[PDB]
Amino acid sequence: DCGQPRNLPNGDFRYTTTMGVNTYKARIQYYCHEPYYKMQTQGVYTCTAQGIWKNEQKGEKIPRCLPVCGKPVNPVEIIGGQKAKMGNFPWQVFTNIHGRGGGALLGDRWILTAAHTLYPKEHEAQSNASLDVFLGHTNVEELMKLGNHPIRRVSVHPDYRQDESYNFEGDIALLELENSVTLGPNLLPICLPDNDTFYDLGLMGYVSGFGAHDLRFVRLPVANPQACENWLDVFSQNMFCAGHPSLKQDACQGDAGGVFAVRDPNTDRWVATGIVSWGIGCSRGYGFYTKVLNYVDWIKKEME
Numbered sequence: 001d002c003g004q005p006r007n008l009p010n011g012d013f014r015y016t017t018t019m020g021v022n023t024y025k026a027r028i029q030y031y032c033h034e035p036y037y038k039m040q041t042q043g044v045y046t047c048t049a050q051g052i053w054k055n056e057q058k059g060e061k062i063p064r065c066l067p068v069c070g071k072p073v074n075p076v077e078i079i080g081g082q083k084a085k086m087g088n089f090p091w092q093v094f095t096n097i098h099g100r101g102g103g104a105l106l107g108d109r110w111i112l113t114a115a116h117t118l119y120p121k122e123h124e125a126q127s128n129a130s131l132d133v134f135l136g137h138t139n140v141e142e143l144m145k146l147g148n149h150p151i152r153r154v155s156v157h158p159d160y161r162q163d164e165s166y167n168f169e170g171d172i173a174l175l176e177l178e179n180s181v182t183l184g185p186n187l188l189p190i191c192l193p194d195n196d197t198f199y200d201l202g203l204m205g206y207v208s209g210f211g212a213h214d215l216r217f218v219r220l221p222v223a224n225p226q227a228c229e230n231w232l233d234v235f236s237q238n239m240f241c242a243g244h245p246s247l248k249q250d251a252c253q254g255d256a257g258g259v260f261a262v263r264d265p266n267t268d269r270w271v272a273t274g275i276v277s278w279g280i281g282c283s284r285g286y287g288f289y290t291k292v293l294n295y296v297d298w299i300k301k302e303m304e
């Protein structure tokens, strides 16, 4: 006689044998909660004669449920600078550390964001400063009504430098929420890039952000690193330019630590390819973002 099958968070299990009898020969089946989670690919265990539940492949250890990244229940389709509707950008995070910021949800309990966001901007005075993070809506007062999410710890890329006044490398950070969130149709994860070909000229992505009450967005193309010249050019190996002389002041729709979201057509997902950085004014219609892919192996090792 075995015991009470171990629990499987974000998932459960059913008995395929008389139910409630964990005696020798019993047999159960695990299943992650649909549709927001999915087993790590059928999760069948059976009380061996010895006295433990097993699975002829990884036996003795319970499967793992994960969430589905970049795949909202409300996507959207030239170029523009319009308003956002509940669902379009589900992985969107609005912060309020040292001023208004942004960030993208990763997985179940981590938020991606640019590092310079966590520190006051120079020429600004030092101060107490709670870290406020919100998600699950497009309006500001609403995101507030919902309340903020307590942060457990804060990991900032080791390359970033505070005394350096121009960080064209390592302007990325990860915040670990203290309690996972409640994945709804309005609040869901975004995927990470893996193909170097995600940073190709002309590629069309979307940027979203507040200004300032209702979250807006823009559909801009990846530009040539030359376009972003006044901001300084080895700024190519750690970042990328993007925008168009047409957009005007809307090329800077993003907030800061917000995200540059592209949608892979071969798999119709959604991947965060960049992080709006420390720039300040899209006068010509251009702006630079940090290359996320250069930091993927980092992101993952932090999330374990």
Ligand SMILES: *[C@H]1O[C@H](CO)[C@@H](O)[C@H](O)[C@H]1NC(C)=O
Pocket (backbone or CB within 6 Å): 128, 129, 130
């Ligand atoms: C700033 O520190 C905390 C921030 O939450 C606040 O409670 C406090 O009143 C401020 N500093 C003081 C002691 O005035």
